[model samples]
Target: HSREVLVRLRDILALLADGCKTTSLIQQRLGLSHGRAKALIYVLEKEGRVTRVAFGNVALVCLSMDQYRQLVDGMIREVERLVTTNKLKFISPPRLHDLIIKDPQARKFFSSIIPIAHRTAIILSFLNHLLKMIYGEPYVKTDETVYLTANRK
Candidate 1:
């Protein structure tokens, strides 16, 4: 799942690493087809990984590699943690959102990005992006259903 989808997300970061884009639209340069570009934006946005400018709504997607590495390290903690145990999972996104919103340490590590102002609604999207990245390999690659599959290794 990540190979086809998440893999491209890395390219997006690399693209951003060079400099922010005019949203040029990413569909033009990255060759992601507009839909794919939109989807990746959602993922990065949910994580607070990408920064967008208003009017300059105008358009810009900027990812600071500085914050990004911390975010990447944050994923590893969860991965190392969940690989074997209960294998955190649920029936849907709201449930997943609750699980995360309640996690004390989860907040600690991820506060590097999440503002918690979003815990009410789009939090679910954040959960999906987190779990999606966690479960997909070369990161883990097992995939999901039951919402998240931590090992399934």
Candidate 2:
């Protein structure tokens, strides 16, 4: 299935759940096109899932928590699967930078993680050492260099 299609739909659903009613509101919140915004509302309305109230042009589409959870859960699963399968490609070096910038998802994934001192130090050392071995660069470090120091922990 097209995950992007689901992602777009999921965004719409989230916006709706977040109290963004009306086609204009959804489009503005999700940055979706007019056609797509209208299409999504039309599909949901046709299914008799969302009840339209008398709020003029504003669509007061409402759903139960259970209904909302079901869709959100499915979307979360899809996202998790996509991330797990695609994550390793970021650290696959030699072409790491090339791949990272080339793939927006990879870029987003890498950028989203907050850098902790312990984890960042460990990862930096690991990657630098690995690259040194692969490219035949001497893995030499001075006492002043923190990563060069033996682990105290």
Candidate 3:
């Protein structure tokens, strides 16, 4: 079904987000056959979501920045939804990973999605952007809360 294909595509993208990978590595991680993995990679290439490069005799696939941003935004939205639904908790990265990895679905999707260091990098980038948007400046840590100034015309 098309839905199943889309899910597999997302899985592939997630796996590729953190670093470049060879077709064999992708096939192993996704449990996809060689032909299926190559086909999916071709599709991703055609869609501009991934770029293939030759390294020696082998080709590797890596996500484009556009694709990475799209994936990261989707992840943030999902986490926001979970937070709203009271189904998830926000904590340190290791703690969050420990909690999330307990869920079978999360474990399956995220076990190889990205390394913890890369995930933390993405999280910090997102949070920094969010703080800048909310405060109209980069966040500054202090001992007490400070009021934000409202923009006026």
Candidate 4:
């Protein structure tokens, strides 16, 4: 039952990935009653996935980037599982890059193409470090070099 609720919550959260949502919008998107919508929001609030802010007389609900990343990582892990089971083909980095560039969700998450490019580099670096750690590699510091040149008179 908890797993079922989590799946539903993740689905609703995907709808909110792009922008803030009103309670009515959430209710409509999830096809739930007002009470149930409020209840769902309450749970998400407690989990720190969504924040509620006052907008005049009404409140607005917003999803956090951290939670959004968590959802994406979950999806990635599921894909990896499928690949391991031979249920799905493994996606190459080039294909993944193309998919990200064309994906609406990626566009919504990133404000511009520049940031996405930088983000890709950062993710790659992190993954490189993570792989090293997984292989029990000891951290090695690179040699630092300094050059001092006298100013010509």
How far off is residue 139 in model 1, in Å?
18
lDDT of 4 by residue, 1-153 (tens): 388678767866776776655676677667888887888788888987888754333455778755434543543443343334443232333333444446565533322211234345443333233223222332332331111111101
When 3 and 4 are scored with lDDT, the better candidate is: 3
lDDT of each: 0.54, 0.44, 0.55, 0.49
Q: Candidate 3's residue-wise lDDT over 16-46, tens digit each?
A: 7665666767888788998999998999999
Per-prediction TM-score to the true structure, in the order listed: 0.40, 0.35, 0.42, 0.40
Candidate 4 lDDT = 0.49
Q: Model 2: per-residue lDDT, tens digit, 21-113? A: 445556666788889877776666676656444322233344544543453344234333443565532222223433444567644543322
- Encode model 1's per-residue lDDT on 24-59: one tens digit a residue: 346666777767887887788888878764321134
Q: Please say which candidate is ahead in TM-score: 3 or 4.
A: 3
For each candidate, how many residue pairs have backbone atoms clashing (under 3 Å)? 6, 0, 0, 0
* Top candidate, metric TM-score: 3
Q: Model 3, poorest ten-residue lDDT window?
A: 144-153
lDDT of 2 at 143: 29
**TM-score of model 1 vs. true structure:** 0.40
Over 4 Å off, model 4 = 1-4, 65-153
The pairs that clash in candidate 4 are: none
